[PDB]
From a paper:
The essentiality of dTTP for DNA synthesis makes TMPK a desirable drug target. E. chaffeensis is the causative agent of human monocytotropic ehrlichiosis (HME). The fold seen for EhchA.01616.a/TMPK is as expected for TMPKs: a central five-stranded β-sheet is sandwiched between two α-helices on one side and five α-helices on the other.
Here, the 2.15 Å resolution crystal structure of thymidylate kinase from E. chaffeensis in the apo form is presented. Interface analysis with PISA supports the presence of two separate dimers (AB and CD). Hence, we are confident that the dimer seen twice in this structure is the native dimer of EhchA.01616.a/TMPK. A sulfate ion could be located in each of the monomers of EhchA.01616.a/TMPK. The nucleotide-binding pocket is structurally conserved between the ADP-bound T. maritima structure and the apo E. chaffeensis structure. In the apo structure this loop is in close proximity to the ATP-binding site, with the loop oriented away from the binding site. The LID region remains unmodeled in the apo EhchA.01616.a/TMPK structure. The Ehrlichia protein is instead a type II TMPK, with the Asp9 residue being followed by a glycine residue.
Author numbering:
A (entry chain B): -2 to 133, 151 to 178, 188 to 201
B (entry chain A): -2 to 134, 151 to 200
C (entry chain C): -2 to 134, 151 to 177, 190 to 200
D (entry chain D): -2 to 134, 151 to 177, 182 to 201
The structure:
Amino acid sequence: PGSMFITFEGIDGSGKTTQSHLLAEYLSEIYGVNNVVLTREPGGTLLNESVRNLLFKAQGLDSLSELLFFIAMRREHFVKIIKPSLMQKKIVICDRFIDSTIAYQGYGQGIDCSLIDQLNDLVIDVYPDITFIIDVDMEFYYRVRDGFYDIAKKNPHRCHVITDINFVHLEVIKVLQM
Amino acid sequence: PGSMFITFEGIDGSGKTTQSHLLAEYLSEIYGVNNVVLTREPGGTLLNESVRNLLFKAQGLDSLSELLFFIAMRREHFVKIIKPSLMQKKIVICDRFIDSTIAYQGYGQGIDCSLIDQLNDLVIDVYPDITFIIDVDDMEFYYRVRDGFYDIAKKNPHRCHVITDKSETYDIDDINFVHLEVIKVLQ
Amino acid sequence: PGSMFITFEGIDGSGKTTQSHLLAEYLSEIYGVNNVVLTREPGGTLLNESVRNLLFKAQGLDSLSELLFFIAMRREHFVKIIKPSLMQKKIVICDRFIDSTIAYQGYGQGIDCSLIDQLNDLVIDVYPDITFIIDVDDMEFYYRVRDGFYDIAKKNPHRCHVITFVHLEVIKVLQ
Amino acid sequence: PGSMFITFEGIDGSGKTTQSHLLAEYLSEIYGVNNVVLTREPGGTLLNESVRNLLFKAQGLDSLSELLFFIAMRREHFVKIIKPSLMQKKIVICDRFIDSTIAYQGYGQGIDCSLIDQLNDLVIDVYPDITFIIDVDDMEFYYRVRDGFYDIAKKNPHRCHVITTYDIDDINFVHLEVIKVLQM
């Protein structure tokens, strides 16, 4: 149908995942299940999902290690799923992407955002057409949220912040179709 | 006893692993088993070993992805195992490290060596004191890798020592010969 | 969605593992894969899995030592996996937990059950909301453990429910 | 020859390991190698040394998990090595034991020393006859551990001996002091 690359972002528990599924079902009804690819990071391939399970069972990663695993995984997910889907003119919807890395590894853990930008640019050559930031150690979580707000202000050509399951879905479609 | 970070490098089938084990035994006898830490990459921690087994079954992994997995594992390994052992003034021997990555990911796979240097410096803050590159006396890929090890040796003469695997004057089995050369560099 | 801590228990071969997966699938379809943590003991973390493998090849390990290894693993598992998942309002499904230790190490091996209780209360601060014991048909040893699971249920009726298709009962009881 | 349970204690780098080997050699010369059992914690059996290697490669244990691993390993070590040796009237020398756990897990990490005492008494039913604490020269953690060893020495004045000019090595000085204390 023509490539489109949509991402959902925000804090865990914000309803990102639910919204990404609701969009997938909506777009699938219009363009056909085969033309819509619903995926997620960290994950999206068998390898990545398997690495994700290991990381979950390890905990206690150095923060830069964690960043680097997420960048490796993104590279693999981009090359195998995202970019070939786009080359084939499908719609890709990804639950968590480059903005989560900035928010969590950058603002949260304190890793330099210019490094994270460089790493993201090293591994992908297509950025999302549109990103929906769903807005719903407390000091950590305040930083992460500030990161998402800053991302939205830095990238208003791409990011749209939707505030506070059906209402949110309706605004997602509204914004998507302008 | 005194911190000392020693790495073994070279193409696969070169005897790096054997030489690393032999030196570990040699130095353990002198300094005590507690003061010699033998490790390897990719690996070194339970997570890294598990990730290594996954990667070993991965079909057609993008070379840039593979580099980044190795750099992530290196970070883990450095922070958990290598740096704290050297802080405790121990000898660390690592079978494969930063030079394998330049030779394989850079020369082999064509990834920018300057990027790989940057990624390595990003993840470690202590370089090996001594690196033994064990030299064996698609094939184009193999030969690029070999070239990579030689250029690293030429670019790092302080740190690296190329040890050839053939006794030129005495009749000595190759494994013992190389080991004796390794011990010789340490004097 | 809301924290819920569910354990499956029973003798080896009871089908508790199969049931734990099936409940995970059923709940994952309702609340999302990300809000359902499927885990197990002994295990749950890479360290615990490696230690478990060692314990499996250990010949004639002192039973109190073995108890303490399983208690150290449970603590690690609880701190790293179970508690943080529950704090994030997720559902945790654990295949084997505190009751397995009571049945195998207390009733089976003869270690004082009140010691086992004390060690369990030392390492965890959240008990399961519901425990499903799946029931099936040296045997003296095996019968004491089986009986152990009945007796635990009897002492903890507010928490344990014994099941004698099995999956449909689990879902009906959970509702 | 006679049951004797000796331990060596102190912070890492203090020379505990070296002093335990030297004492093992000295006593093996007098009583015979078969009558002196040199061992260590955490470790001392194949299972324990394998667990130790896994702990090294996992890092970032909860402090209570770590304690409990060390206690499980102590139980196994006591049952298989220490108690049978003492029952045979041999001399047992252990590099690190109950006092390390108090200093590190208790004073260092903050776990209640009473809990540690109860866990120790759960797994062993004899204390060392003599314990040599070798006193050597995040830093907060370090200072707490060192303080713990001093407190242990004060609370156990019978069992514990803190060892701190002659024309010899520090290693040999400490070794001779250990021998001298032993002849009392």
